[PDB]
Amino acid sequence: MNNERIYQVLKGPVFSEKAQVLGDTAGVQVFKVDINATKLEIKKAVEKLFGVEVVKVNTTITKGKTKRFGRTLGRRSDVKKAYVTLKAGQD
């Protein structure tokens, strides 16, 4: 795989109550990822760019909301979230 795509697979971490509880109690990291990323791609990117070993990856897609600002109607973009479970105690 190309490092160019490796460096773009991961967008940013997720901060929320569910993510905090999961990280604290099970060592699961929640990431915002590219809409077109695969589980294997995310696994490889996490291992390469964080020096940790991944056991399993779970993914889900949430559709963007339709908002009304003034008289204009718009839609936000879809988001993909990855749950990555690490081995034993890591990170």
């Binding site: 490092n3 460096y7 991961l10 971490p13």
Partner: peptide, 12 residues
């Protein structure tokens, strides 16, 4: 490119 990824991580 690695620096750009790290900057994105930091901004997040």
């Amino acid at each position: 490119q690695l620096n750009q990824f790290r900057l994105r991580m930091a901004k997040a």
